[PDB]
């Protein structure tokens, strides 16, 4: 689904600094890539850093990424594979999560990506994400989780 982004969402500089786990997605991308960790460093209003992920073909790999920010959209570019490379629009930022939306070659009709401060986020964080989604015309029901990361005993 195309979202209805909110009207004057501030994307604060450095709001994306540090470690994130990309655990939830629409549509579900986790049968092709999994265990996704991102680490960003500020470079003025932009970021640069690293994405590590487990590839069914390659195992644990690392990639250099750049985020080039412009208002509320950014350009995601990865160094050695470009299937996720796109303009992404910020749908929500928060201390504990952020939500992007783009059309990379791997999902050219639209890909929403939820990144979390926590590997296995707790229910209060999840409830907020649910609320943030409904408020941009999306629904958490239609997202898939990275189930290869164990969040339950």
Ligand X SMILES: *[C@@H]1O[C@H](CO)[C@@H](O[C@@H]2O[C@H](CO)[C@@H](O)[C@H](O)[C@H]2NC(C)=O)[C@H](O)[C@H]1NC(C)=O
Q: Which of ligand X, ligand NAG, none has residue 54 at its interface (CB below 5 to 8 Å by kind)? A: ligand X
Instruction: Of 4, 44, 12, 33, give the one whose Cα is nearest residue 148.
Output: 33
CB-nearer residue toward ligand X: 58 or 153: 58
Binding to ligand NAG in span 118-137, by CB under 6 A? 126
Q: How buried is 115 (Cβ within 10 angstroms: 0-12 exposed, 13-18 middle, 19+ buried)? A: buried
Reported as type and span, the H/E element at residue 35 is strand 34-43
Cα–Cα distance measured from residue 96 to residue 139, given in angstroms and rounded to the nearest whole number: 19
CB-nearer residue toward ligand X: 79 or 135: 79
Residue 71 structure tokens: 């208002």
Contact status: 81 vs ligand NAG (CB under 6 A): no
Q: Which of ligand NAG, ligand X, none has residue 17 at its interface (CB below 5 to 8 Å by kind)? A: none
Cα–Cα distance measured from residue 60 to residue 35, given in angstroms and rounded to the nearest whole number: 9
Contact status: 145 vs ligand NAG (CB under 6 A): yes
User: Nearest-CB residue to ligand NAG?
Assistant: 145
Residues that bind ligand NAG (CB under 6 A): 126, 143-145, 151
């Amino acid at each position: 689904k195309e979202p209805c982004p909110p009207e004057n969402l501030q994307l604060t500089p450095r709001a994306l600094v540090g470690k994130w786990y990309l655990r939830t997605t629409s549509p579900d991308i986790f049968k092709q890539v999994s265990n996704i960790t991102e680490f960003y460093s500020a470079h003025g209003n932009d970021y640069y850093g690293t994405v590590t992920d487990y590839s069914p073909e390659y195992g644990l790999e690392a990639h250099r990424v750049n985020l080039t920010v412009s208002g509320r959209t950014l350009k995601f570019y990865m160094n050695d594979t470009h299937e996720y490379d796109s303009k992404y629009e910020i749908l929500a930022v928060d201390k504990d999560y952020f939500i992007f939306y783009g059309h990379p070659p791997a999902a050219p009709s639209g890909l929403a990506l939820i990144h979390y401060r926590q590997s296995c986020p707790k229910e209060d964080v999840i409830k907020r994400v649910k609320k943030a989604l409904k408020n941009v015309c999306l629904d958490y029901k239609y997202f898939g989780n990275d189930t290869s990361v164990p969040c339950h005993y």
